Amino acid sequence: SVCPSDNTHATGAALQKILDYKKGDHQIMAGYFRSWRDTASGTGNKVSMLDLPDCLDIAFVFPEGDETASFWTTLKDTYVPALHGRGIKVVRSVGIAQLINTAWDNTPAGWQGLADALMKTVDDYGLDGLDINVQQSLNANQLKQATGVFNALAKKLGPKSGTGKLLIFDTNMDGTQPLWRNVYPTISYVLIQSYGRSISGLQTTYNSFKSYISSKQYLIGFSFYEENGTNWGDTTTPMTSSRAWQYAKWQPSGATKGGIFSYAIDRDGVAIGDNTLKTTDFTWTRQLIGAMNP
Numbered sequence: 287s288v289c290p291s292d293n294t295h296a297t298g299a300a301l302q303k304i305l306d307y308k309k310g311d312h313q314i315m316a317g318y319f320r321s322w323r324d325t326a327s328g329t330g331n332k333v334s335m336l337d338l339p340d341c342l343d344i345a346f347v348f349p350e351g352d353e354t355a356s357f358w359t360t361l362k363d364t365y366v367p368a369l370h371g372r373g374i375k376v377v378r379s380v381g382i383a384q385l386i387n388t389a390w391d392n393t394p395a396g397w398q399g400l401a402d403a404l405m406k407t408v409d410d411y412g413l414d415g416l417d418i419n420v421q422q423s424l425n426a427n428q429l430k431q432a433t434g435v436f437n438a439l440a441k442k443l444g445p446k447s448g449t450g451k452l453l454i455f456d457t458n459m460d461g462t463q464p465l466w467r468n469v470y471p472t473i474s475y476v477l478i479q480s481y482g483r484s485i486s487g488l489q490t491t492y493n494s495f496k497s498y499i500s501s502k503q504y505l506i507g508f509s510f511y512e513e514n515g516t517n518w519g520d521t522t523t524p525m526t527s528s529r530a531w532q533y534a535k536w537q538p539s540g541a542t543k544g545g546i547f548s549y550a551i552d553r554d555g556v557a558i559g560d561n562t563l564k565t566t567d568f569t570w571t572r573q574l575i576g577a578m579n580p
């Protein structure tokens with residue numbers, strides 16, 4: 287209720303009230319910003335990470351791996367400080383593929399070396415932590431390497447580090463995945479990719495994790511419509527009937543969830559089927575923040 291009804295960017299009094307909101311108890315909002323859709327990357331893009339709503343908790347930098355040096359420069363020099371001004375945390379996402387890369391020794395030294403290399407994606411940009419995207423099962427050697435890397439990262443990020451920086455586990459699999467069973471003690475938040483998913487399933491998936499976390503570490507994710515993308519149908523009209531809305535309102539039985547996240551937050555409000563790039567006032571984000579913290 288200290289959050290703008292449009293996407294205004296507070297400056298003084300209006301700002302401090304948003305900072306103090308974020309310092310206190312709330313269901314948090316996170317969003318994956320597709321780096322290749324930032325105005326500072328290539329051309330033709332309409333949305334910039336500077337547009338992101340003041341009442342957002344975490345912004346994920348999600349590169350595809352071809353983004354121009356302009357974007358990274360902009361991120362370091364411009365976007366991170368501005369987003370830090372609004373009390374918005376900025377977190378680099380990387381695929382689990384990076385943590386099981388066989389170019390890196392499957393040894394203690396190898397795990398540290400790989401962690402150090404991944405920590406440069408955080409430190410070199412003044413980021414608030416690292417998000418590992420886990421969407422695949424692992425063999426015994428891949429598991430051993432990924433676990434080692436998590437344990438090394440845990441010295442600088444997440445609940446074991448004492449730095450206040452985040453180590454985030456984002457996945458479309460459940461809490462029986464061996465990697466989760468090995469690294470759950472290192473994890474700040476666990477974000478469940480729940481695009482197109484039955485509301486009837488949310489408790490079942492949550493139950494798989496609940497013994498390893500508090501409810502406040504758990505987030506569920508819906509997708510915005512990606513240009514030429516999968517039709518998850520998470521953002522159908524009317525809004526207050528959408529899967530996204532149902533996610534904001536959903537609570538595990540007996541407890542309160544940590545919040546929700548959007549994939550492709552740069553596509554906030556673009557209709558399902560509209561494959562053009564457009565600007566956004568982040569209506570859906572700000573509305574869903576309000577629907578969680580009334």
Ligand SMILES: CC(=O)N[C@@H]1[C@@H](O)[C@H](O)[C@@H](CO[C@@H]2O[C@@H](C)[C@@H](O)[C@@H](O)[C@@H]2O)O[C@H]1NC(=O)C[C@H](N)C(=O)O
Nearest residue numbers: 421457458459478479480481482483507508516517518
């Ligand atoms: C091969 C492929 O397209 N994989 C994508 C993957 O790259 C996406 O990030 C992923 C995100 O969604 C999550 O995983 C799936 C498996 C479900 O469990 C979702 O509910 C999760 O949020 O999705 C993959 N794409 C698909 O699964 C699309 C699917 N084949 C379809 O056409 O409906």
